[PDB]
Amino acid sequence: NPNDDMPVDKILEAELISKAADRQLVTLVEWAKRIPHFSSLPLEDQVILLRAGWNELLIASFSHRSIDVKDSILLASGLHVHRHSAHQAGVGPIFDRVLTELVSKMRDMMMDKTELGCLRAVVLFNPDVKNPSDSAHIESLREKVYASLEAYCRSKYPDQPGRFAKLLLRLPALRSIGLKCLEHLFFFKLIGDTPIDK
Amino acid sequence: NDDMPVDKILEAELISDPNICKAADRQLVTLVEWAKRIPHFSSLPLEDQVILLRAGWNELLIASFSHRSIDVKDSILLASGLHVHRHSAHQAGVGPIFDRVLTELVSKMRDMMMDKTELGCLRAVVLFNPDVKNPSDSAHIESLREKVYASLEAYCRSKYPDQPGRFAKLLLRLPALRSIGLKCLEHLFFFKLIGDTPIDKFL
Amino acid sequence: NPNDDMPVDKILEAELISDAADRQLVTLVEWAKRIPHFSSLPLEDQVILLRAGWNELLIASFSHRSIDVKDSILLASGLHVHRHSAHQAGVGPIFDRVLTELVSKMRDMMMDKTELGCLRAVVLFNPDVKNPSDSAHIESLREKVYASLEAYCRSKYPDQPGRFAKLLLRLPALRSIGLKCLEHLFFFKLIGDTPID
Amino acid sequence: DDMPVDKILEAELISDCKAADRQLVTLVEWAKRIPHFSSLPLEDQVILLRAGWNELLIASFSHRSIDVKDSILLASGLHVHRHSAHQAGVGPIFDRVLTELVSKMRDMMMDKTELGCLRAVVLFNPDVKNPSDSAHIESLREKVYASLEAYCRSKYPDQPGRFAKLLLRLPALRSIGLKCLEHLFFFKLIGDTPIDKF
């Protein structure tokens, strides 16, 4: 029973996703459904888990996108955001945190997509979420993910004993950075001038 | 007095409110339309007529939707229809502030029967905020504020004569409005209301 | 009619009589007792009000002292902190707000001690502070304070009709500014960092 | 060198107003009693303290509860109440500390050696601002959770994914840590009882 409860090879498939700014890359919900047993979860909890974790799932995603590019974020499309551009925008320190704490640590560690999928899956399955309906159901799914993720680890990377407990130790940083992006100043610094007086 | 009439303010207040969360544009436009109708606001340097909009928009909408929620009981009726519900804003993690809004504004506005002319005067006082950082007029912006509450006192005196402390009661709702504004700003309360549903469940 | 319930003279007295760290015991709780019929309130409500208001109560007092010194907030212990100094301390913008919104405006209308006492008493009787015994009794004392303040403002300053309102319209700034002085970053910027070991 | 979990247990057992200096002291004592901490630059040895003191304290008093109803127990034996924390303006955080940490330390019955290892993981934070070579701080963390896994296997072999949590309790510890600084939670639960009468 390695990962029969939570495939892993199916989590990779979910991962393999191919002038008012906004471009809805909320394909994140297509991803959520493609994660095993998410649609089995109560519908009330499904929307609760996504509303709770959207900001971290997206931040971990583009962090792992810019593993190849230097000192830059690179959004899901081509928007190559630079450090100087961020520091001018007013989102400087938060930009550096994303780099040195997530993309840099992912890069040095050679985190693959099926590891990314599992960390994100663990984020999705948040048991701390408020008023779920079945926290034990959520609890169980999370377990089956990191169980399978530990099994995926120590097989593809058997010479690295504590690689499993290194992937998991990025989540505290993802939590911290996630909060910072939700701050209102962040959202208004990203805008700028406006001076939009008709 | 003659250069800050209560009817023009009441009319401005009456004309306003008879993802693709661009309902936020259908309220930002109303706010600028509303501001222009408040006497002497257009006759004001653009470098002020704009920076006290950026300073006040948050409290202005809270006073609006608070007064707009006197007829509901445990909700916030907003812009166009859409109840939001107590037992729902607590799901969004923004319940505590949702609470002290019903109680500190909606309740106090309900139990006082605050009318649309007073609401408009208070919102107009909030609009002409002389504590803005680097304005142009400064003293003019203040004198405008002064002419609003002068007219608003006179209005309360000539309608609620049996309530001598009526004028002060309205003014002492503003620090609570100030505090509630800071918190609503912090939590993006306004965007959680108009974004609440958008509860698109295509899953 | 006028202030037999909430005498301004007694509130004036309250202000008048209020004339290596290891420190601090500011008992404005003494002042609180002097405010007419404060001790008439329940003991629990007595604590609930002081814990809500202490930061605003004190910060108004420092603003009222610093009227005889430009671009500098004179301390209560006899100190003198300058604008440029607190900007280097990291807490400049907040110092400007205390300087231009409270201090500056208290001087331009020459707020007297009896009025300051009332504003602070209006702050003392916060009816928004939730879970007290009575949410209307503290509001009753609120009403009686500013009832007297208004009457006082008519007598001593008859040619200034909008004065009474001008007084009350400083409270929102006192609210906003007080809230900023309770941020942890604030309390850390004026100490610590390193200042080592 | 090494990272013996029994000595981490020692640190935790030897530990059990500005009088709360008798806890910053208790912290640096515990910290000093951790392997390789004292044997490290004073700069990095104090940067870690500046960074993690808040989380370190929360993980303690959250565990120090458990054997208690709706309250949090401290190093003075004084019970700060849920019925008081709400009246002190920090109710929502209190409930979060209880629900996300205390209740979960209870349900799984975390122990002192496990607690001290998580505290030690927080101590050796490699994401720190300016370390004198983060590699050491990082490696020490690696040696600590290497032992915490080993401990949890032998001590609790009927629950294999036990090591996965404890670690997955750190994201929650961060979000709460951030929220406690913001609210000045720590200072509000040592000053709650100190309330003078007249």
mmCIF file of C-alpha atoms in Angstrom, chain B residues 9-198:
data_model
loop_
_atom_site.group_PDB
_atom_site.id
_atom_site.type_symbol
_atom_site.label_atom_id
_atom_site.label_comp_id
_atom_site.label_asym_id
_atom_site.label_seq_id
_atom_site.Cartn_x
_atom_site.Cartn_y
_atom_site.Cartn_z
ATOM 1 C CA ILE B 9 -26.491 67.446 0.284
ATOM 2 C CA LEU B 10 -29.694 65.423 0.743
ATOM 3 C CA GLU B 11 -30.166 65.416 -3.053
ATOM 4 C CA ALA B 12 -26.574 64.268 -3.625
ATOM 5 C CA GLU B 13 -27.180 61.492 -1.080
ATOM 6 C CA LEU B 14 -30.504 60.593 -2.743
ATOM 7 C CA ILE B 15 -29.118 60.401 -6.296
ATOM 8 C CA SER B 16 -26.342 58.043 -5.143
ATOM 9 C CA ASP B 17 -27.967 54.653 -4.431
ATOM 10 C CA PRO B 18 -31.679 55.068 -5.299
ATOM 11 C CA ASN B 19 -12.270 38.420 -10.988
ATOM 12 C CA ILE B 20 -14.977 40.684 -12.463
ATOM 13 C CA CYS B 21 -15.786 42.432 -9.167
ATOM 14 C CA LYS B 22 -16.452 45.623 -11.140
ATOM 15 C CA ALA B 23 -19.323 46.407 -8.807
ATOM 16 C CA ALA B 24 -16.402 48.214 -7.122
ATOM 17 C CA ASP B 25 -16.421 50.537 -10.159
ATOM 18 C CA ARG B 26 -20.211 50.970 -9.837
ATOM 19 C CA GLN B 27 -19.512 52.425 -6.360
ATOM 20 C CA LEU B 28 -16.247 54.321 -6.988
ATOM 21 C CA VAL B 29 -18.062 56.184 -9.804
ATOM 22 C CA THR B 30 -21.055 56.898 -7.535
ATOM 23 C CA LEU B 31 -18.685 58.243 -4.868
ATOM 24 C CA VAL B 32 -17.034 60.709 -7.284
ATOM 25 C CA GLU B 33 -20.434 61.720 -8.690
ATOM 26 C CA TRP B 34 -21.642 62.170 -5.091
ATOM 27 C CA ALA B 35 -18.593 64.218 -4.056
ATOM 28 C CA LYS B 36 -19.069 66.605 -7.015
ATOM 29 C CA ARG B 37 -22.660 67.268 -5.885
ATOM 30 C CA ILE B 38 -21.610 68.291 -2.354
ATOM 31 C CA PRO B 39 -21.411 72.144 -2.494
ATOM 32 C CA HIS B 40 -17.982 73.774 -3.024
ATOM 33 C CA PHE B 41 -16.257 70.425 -3.713
ATOM 34 C CA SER B 42 -15.883 71.076 -7.447
ATOM 35 C CA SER B 43 -14.863 74.662 -6.633
ATOM 36 C CA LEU B 44 -11.685 73.315 -5.030
ATOM 37 C CA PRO B 45 -8.117 72.570 -6.230
ATOM 38 C CA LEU B 46 -7.976 69.206 -8.063
ATOM 39 C CA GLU B 47 -4.896 68.372 -5.955
ATOM 40 C CA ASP B 48 -7.313 68.434 -2.987
ATOM 41 C CA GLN B 49 -10.459 67.350 -4.852
ATOM 42 C CA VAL B 50 -8.972 63.839 -5.253
ATOM 43 C CA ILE B 51 -6.572 63.378 -2.316
ATOM 44 C CA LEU B 52 -9.414 63.701 0.198
ATOM 45 C CA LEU B 53 -11.303 61.170 -1.948
ATOM 46 C CA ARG B 54 -8.351 58.769 -1.572
ATOM 47 C CA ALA B 55 -8.399 59.615 2.162
ATOM 48 C CA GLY B 56 -12.160 59.271 2.702
ATOM 49 C CA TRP B 57 -13.579 56.665 0.280
ATOM 50 C CA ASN B 58 -13.307 53.868 2.856
ATOM 51 C CA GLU B 59 -15.250 55.566 5.670
ATOM 52 C CA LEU B 60 -17.710 57.047 3.155
ATOM 53 C CA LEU B 61 -18.744 53.578 1.930
ATOM 54 C CA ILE B 62 -18.988 52.237 5.510
ATOM 55 C CA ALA B 63 -21.301 55.067 6.567
ATOM 56 C CA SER B 64 -23.278 54.404 3.384
ATOM 57 C CA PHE B 65 -23.747 50.633 3.730
ATOM 58 C CA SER B 66 -24.247 50.973 7.495
ATOM 59 C CA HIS B 67 -27.204 53.323 6.967
ATOM 60 C CA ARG B 68 -28.319 51.132 4.056
ATOM 61 C CA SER B 69 -28.550 48.199 6.512
ATOM 62 C CA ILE B 70 -31.023 49.670 9.026
ATOM 63 C CA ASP B 71 -33.913 47.642 7.519
ATOM 64 C CA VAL B 72 -32.056 44.295 7.634
ATOM 65 C CA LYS B 73 -31.268 42.714 11.027
ATOM 66 C CA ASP B 74 -28.049 40.639 10.862
ATOM 67 C CA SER B 75 -26.697 41.659 7.439
ATOM 68 C CA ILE B 76 -25.251 44.423 5.262
ATOM 69 C CA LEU B 77 -27.414 45.394 2.281
ATOM 70 C CA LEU B 78 -25.050 46.918 -0.282
ATOM 71 C CA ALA B 79 -24.834 48.865 -3.580
ATOM 72 C CA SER B 80 -27.367 46.763 -5.472
ATOM 73 C CA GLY B 81 -29.370 44.193 -3.469
ATOM 74 C CA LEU B 82 -27.303 41.309 -2.071
ATOM 75 C CA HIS B 83 -27.560 40.571 1.653
ATOM 76 C CA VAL B 84 -24.206 39.360 3.035
ATOM 77 C CA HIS B 85 -25.247 37.843 6.420
ATOM 78 C CA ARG B 86 -23.536 37.686 9.833
ATOM 79 C CA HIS B 87 -23.168 33.913 9.599
ATOM 80 C CA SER B 88 -21.057 34.203 6.439
ATOM 81 C CA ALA B 89 -18.722 37.138 7.143
ATOM 82 C CA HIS B 90 -17.427 34.975 10.018
ATOM 83 C CA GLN B 91 -16.685 32.272 7.431
ATOM 84 C CA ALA B 92 -14.593 34.817 5.491
ATOM 85 C CA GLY B 93 -12.513 35.337 8.667
ATOM 86 C CA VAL B 94 -13.640 38.950 8.849
ATOM 87 C CA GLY B 95 -16.503 38.483 11.341
ATOM 88 C CA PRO B 96 -15.232 40.462 14.362
ATOM 89 C CA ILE B 97 -15.114 43.678 12.285
ATOM 90 C CA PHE B 98 -18.456 42.744 10.662
ATOM 91 C CA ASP B 99 -19.812 42.563 14.235
ATOM 92 C CA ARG B 100 -18.597 45.997 15.397
ATOM 93 C CA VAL B 101 -20.265 47.715 12.443
ATOM 94 C CA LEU B 102 -23.748 46.345 12.979
ATOM 95 C CA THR B 103 -23.424 47.321 16.660
ATOM 96 C CA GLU B 104 -21.284 50.493 16.539
ATOM 97 C CA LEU B 105 -22.900 52.005 13.410
ATOM 98 C CA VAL B 106 -26.000 50.210 12.059
ATOM 99 C CA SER B 107 -27.493 49.738 15.551
ATOM 100 C CA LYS B 108 -26.631 53.256 16.739
ATOM 101 C CA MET B 109 -27.968 54.663 13.437
ATOM 102 C CA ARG B 110 -31.130 52.526 13.793
ATOM 103 C CA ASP B 111 -31.842 53.330 17.460
ATOM 104 C CA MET B 112 -31.354 57.045 16.637
ATOM 105 C CA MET B 113 -33.397 57.063 13.383
ATOM 106 C CA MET B 114 -30.561 58.880 11.576
ATOM 107 C CA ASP B 115 -32.073 60.379 8.398
ATOM 108 C CA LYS B 116 -30.545 60.694 4.911
ATOM 109 C CA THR B 117 -29.796 64.426 5.300
ATOM 110 C CA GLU B 118 -27.777 63.815 8.487
ATOM 111 C CA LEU B 119 -26.064 60.787 6.948
ATOM 112 C CA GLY B 120 -25.151 63.033 4.011
ATOM 113 C CA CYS B 121 -23.858 65.786 6.293
ATOM 114 C CA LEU B 122 -21.690 63.355 8.271
ATOM 115 C CA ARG B 123 -20.382 61.842 5.044
ATOM 116 C CA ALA B 124 -19.716 65.411 3.848
ATOM 117 C CA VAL B 125 -17.815 66.169 7.088
ATOM 118 C CA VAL B 126 -15.779 62.991 6.480
ATOM 119 C CA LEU B 127 -15.209 64.167 2.887
ATOM 120 C CA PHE B 128 -13.835 67.579 3.908
ATOM 121 C CA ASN B 129 -11.097 66.087 6.124
ATOM 122 C CA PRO B 130 -8.621 68.834 7.108
ATOM 123 C CA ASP B 131 -6.126 66.278 8.521
ATOM 124 C CA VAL B 132 -4.987 65.212 5.021
ATOM 125 C CA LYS B 133 -1.176 65.246 4.737
ATOM 126 C CA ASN B 134 -0.205 67.770 2.014
ATOM 127 C CA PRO B 135 -3.285 69.578 0.619
ATOM 128 C CA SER B 136 -3.457 72.902 -1.264
ATOM 129 C CA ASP B 137 -6.357 74.795 0.341
ATOM 130 C CA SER B 138 -6.081 73.350 3.884
ATOM 131 C CA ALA B 139 -7.970 76.233 5.554
ATOM 132 C CA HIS B 140 -10.616 76.238 2.811
ATOM 133 C CA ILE B 141 -11.099 72.467 3.221
ATOM 134 C CA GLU B 142 -11.540 73.129 6.956
ATOM 135 C CA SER B 143 -13.983 76.041 6.528
ATOM 136 C CA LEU B 144 -16.093 73.825 4.235
ATOM 137 C CA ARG B 145 -16.217 71.150 6.969
ATOM 138 C CA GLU B 146 -17.177 73.897 9.429
ATOM 139 C CA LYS B 147 -20.058 75.053 7.219
ATOM 140 C CA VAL B 148 -21.373 71.467 6.996
ATOM 141 C CA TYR B 149 -21.747 70.832 10.752
ATOM 142 C CA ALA B 150 -23.048 74.380 11.258
ATOM 143 C CA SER B 151 -25.845 73.581 8.800
ATOM 144 C CA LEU B 152 -26.252 70.093 10.295
ATOM 145 C CA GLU B 153 -26.670 71.478 13.828
ATOM 146 C CA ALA B 154 -29.238 73.994 12.552
ATOM 147 C CA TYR B 155 -31.012 71.106 10.782
ATOM 148 C CA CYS B 156 -31.128 69.006 13.976
ATOM 149 C CA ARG B 157 -32.287 72.017 16.013
ATOM 150 C CA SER B 158 -35.143 72.633 13.540
ATOM 151 C CA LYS B 159 -36.445 69.030 13.511
ATOM 152 C CA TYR B 160 -35.410 67.407 16.797
ATOM 153 C CA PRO B 161 -35.856 70.330 19.235
ATOM 154 C CA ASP B 162 -36.679 67.925 22.089
ATOM 155 C CA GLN B 163 -33.230 66.361 21.507
ATOM 156 C CA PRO B 164 -30.712 69.123 22.416
ATOM 157 C CA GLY B 165 -27.741 66.701 22.343
ATOM 158 C CA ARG B 166 -28.693 65.344 18.894
ATOM 159 C CA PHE B 167 -25.993 67.265 17.017
ATOM 160 C CA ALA B 168 -23.215 65.952 19.288
ATOM 161 C CA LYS B 169 -24.562 62.379 19.063
ATOM 162 C CA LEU B 170 -23.988 62.304 15.280
ATOM 163 C CA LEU B 171 -20.469 63.754 15.619
ATOM 164 C CA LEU B 172 -19.472 61.150 18.240
ATOM 165 C CA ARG B 173 -20.186 58.397 15.699
ATOM 166 C CA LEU B 174 -17.190 59.591 13.627
ATOM 167 C CA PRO B 175 -14.320 58.283 15.801
ATOM 168 C CA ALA B 176 -16.016 54.845 15.784
ATOM 169 C CA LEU B 177 -16.305 55.272 11.996
ATOM 170 C CA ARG B 178 -12.608 56.232 11.916
ATOM 171 C CA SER B 179 -11.551 53.157 13.873
ATOM 172 C CA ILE B 180 -13.845 50.833 11.888
ATOM 173 C CA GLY B 181 -12.401 52.317 8.678
ATOM 174 C CA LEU B 182 -8.814 51.457 9.642
ATOM 175 C CA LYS B 183 -9.841 47.843 10.354
ATOM 176 C CA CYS B 184 -11.972 47.516 7.204
ATOM 177 C CA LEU B 185 -8.987 48.837 5.250
ATOM 178 C CA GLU B 186 -6.654 46.315 6.918
ATOM 179 C CA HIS B 187 -8.848 43.269 6.182
ATOM 180 C CA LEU B 188 -10.072 44.433 2.743
ATOM 181 C CA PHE B 189 -13.570 44.258 4.255
ATOM 182 C CA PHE B 190 -15.207 46.140 1.369
ATOM 183 C CA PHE B 191 -13.764 43.794 -1.269
ATOM 184 C CA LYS B 192 -14.842 40.755 0.782
ATOM 185 C CA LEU B 193 -18.434 42.087 0.792
ATOM 186 C CA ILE B 194 -18.721 42.792 -2.955
ATOM 187 C CA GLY B 195 -16.680 39.614 -3.623
ATOM 188 C CA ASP B 196 -18.575 37.424 -1.104
ATOM 189 C CA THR B 197 -20.605 35.961 -3.963
ATOM 190 C CA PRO B 198 -18.652 35.534 -6.526
#
